[PDB]
């Protein structure tokens, strides 16, 4: 995809994350588990909802009665009507079909971007307190219990607190 | 070392969509925007019943072809439903002058 | 034949009681109808590419 995340540096999605579109998987002493990110899932569901509703809303619908009212000596008008009728069907069929094809590409790129942005959100929080494994995961240079993982997931991770413990583990890896 | 991973949703959906650059792409959720279903009957249109002529043409009903049973005298309708080839048009052969325009007048 | 219903949109084959923007049923409609297309399937993606 355009943003390189979905089916890219994150290979495959998660059957085990039932409660949202994008989220986290943690792994520490206490145990592993999945958690949906609700801010970014709700935003995305807002956008896609709005997209769908606009594609339907913005259509202008008028009353029209369409029949075959011309007789056997009015074939020239009947053909004018056919050209008109057929012409609008060609227009609406092409627009609908391309509209769907084109907004289907944008919706999938939207999700790609949403996932890449979330990865970047955690990246920017953790800085060098974690190694970047490159498959969408961060290996922590410190001990990160459940309340720490929650702080990453809700955007309140305290870099300073763990900063020292982390650099002693990085210094240590330089052996 | 403890880990946190970013990832995205997956499920048991077999709903497929197309894009400009790909076809038969399976997705987690989709939305139909094409109506394909009809109830298979003739209904009122905005609260007003249609005038259904079973085996009669408009000309038969108006002039009172004796095979065109005197209608319940429905005082108002929204559209007219004629069969494709009504059996009871003019019983005595002939023509109806400006018929198509009168029919369009009597449409509603 | 008549079937004691009500629509905004009426087709020779039957009534369309719906608020979608396109339909593929019959062109010779009477009412506030969806736009008629020669299409079997118009489906918008809302979720993401599914795994595997």
């Amino acid at each position: 995809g355009l943003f390189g995340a979905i089916a890219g540096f994150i290979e495959g999605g998660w059957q085990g994350m039932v409660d949202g579109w994008y989220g986290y998987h943690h792994s520490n002493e206490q145990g592993s588990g999945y958690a949906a990110d609700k801010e970014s899932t709700q935003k995305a569901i807002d956008g896609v909802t709005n997209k769908v509703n606009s594609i339907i809303d913005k259509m202008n619908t008028q009353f029209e009665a369409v029949g075959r009212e011309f007789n056997n000596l009015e074939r020239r008008i009947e053909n004018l009507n056919k050209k008109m009728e057929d012409g609008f069907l060609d227009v609406w069929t092409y627009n609908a079909e391309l509209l769907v094809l084109m907004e289907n590409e944008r919706t999938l790129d939207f999700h790609d971007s949403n996932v890449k942005n979330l990865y970047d959100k955690v990246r920017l929080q953790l800085r060098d307190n974690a190694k970047e494994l490159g498959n969408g995961c961060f290996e922590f240079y410190h001990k990160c219990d459940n309340e720490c993982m929650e702080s990453v997931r809700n955007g309140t991770y305290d870099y300073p607190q763990y900063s020292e413990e982390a650099r002693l583990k990085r210094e240590e890896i330089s052996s | 070392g403890d880990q946190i991973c970013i990832g995205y949703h997956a499920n048991n959906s077999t709903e497929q969509v197309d894009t400009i650059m790909e076809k038969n792409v399976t997705v987690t959720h989709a939305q139909d925007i094409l109506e394909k279903k009809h109830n298979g009957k003739l209904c009122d249109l905005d609260g007003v019943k249609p005038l259904i002529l079973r085996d009669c043409s408009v000309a038969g009903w108006l002039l009172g072809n004796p095979m065109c049973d005197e209608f319940i005298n429905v005082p108002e309708w929204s559209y007219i439903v004629e069969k494709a080839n009504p059996v009871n048009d003019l019983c005595y052969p002939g023509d109806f002058n400006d018929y198509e325009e009168l029919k369009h007048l009597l449409s509603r | 034949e008549y079937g004691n219903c009500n629509t905004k949109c009426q087709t020779p084959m039957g009534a369309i009681n719906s608020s979608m923007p396109f339909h593929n049923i019959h062109p010779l409609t009477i009412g506030e109808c969806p736009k008629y297309v020669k299409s079997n399937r118009l489906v918008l993606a809302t979720g993401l590419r599914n795994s595997p």
Partner: antibody
Amino acid sequence: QAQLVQSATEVKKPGASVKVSCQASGFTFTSYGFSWVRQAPGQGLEWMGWISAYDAKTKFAEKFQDRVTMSIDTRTTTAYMEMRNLRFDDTAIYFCAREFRTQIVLGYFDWLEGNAFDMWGQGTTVIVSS
Amino acid sequence: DVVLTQTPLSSPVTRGQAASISCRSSQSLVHSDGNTYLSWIHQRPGQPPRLLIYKISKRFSGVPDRISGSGAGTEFTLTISRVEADDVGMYYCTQASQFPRTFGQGTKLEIKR
């Protein structure tokens, strides 16, 4: 806490008009829609119409289509309902009920901002009597 | 329009026993997203309604597991499985998968003594 507080009671004369307000607080106003529902003395609940706080888009009941108007003020997170040409039948309690922000909903997860009729105002009594 | 036929109108129930309210819709209530937005609300005398069940069978926050929703298609059922005084009031089935919105006639619960 998330809440809906409607306006005080209204005593009106026949022919007059009334404008009941409903103030949202504690939640994102533009994430929701609002149905107006009334309860006449001894009668069951009756839907009057709906308005999106995201869109301003309305939907109406047959019976009130003409003499009711809904509106929205996103700066005071307040929904309104105006009734023209008051009758005696209109003596009732008027509730403002929280609902969906759009007529097509993608309720793909259960905790999403949505769920229709999940939050109600305390009600506004309009009395119509000369 | 969707018609919701609620039955019975009146439901005397002895304290501790179960009550079962029925709601039939004229028509399928499946929204364009797969969800069926058939809900039950409850109104105590002198108070606003409060949501009990959404999506046929899901308990709103705060609602005891003795309150229970079921159904599919066009027949839906609220049961209240050991009734107390606080359960008295009006019960309405409601649908929000479609416009106009619809409510049932109402069911008045009452303690049978």
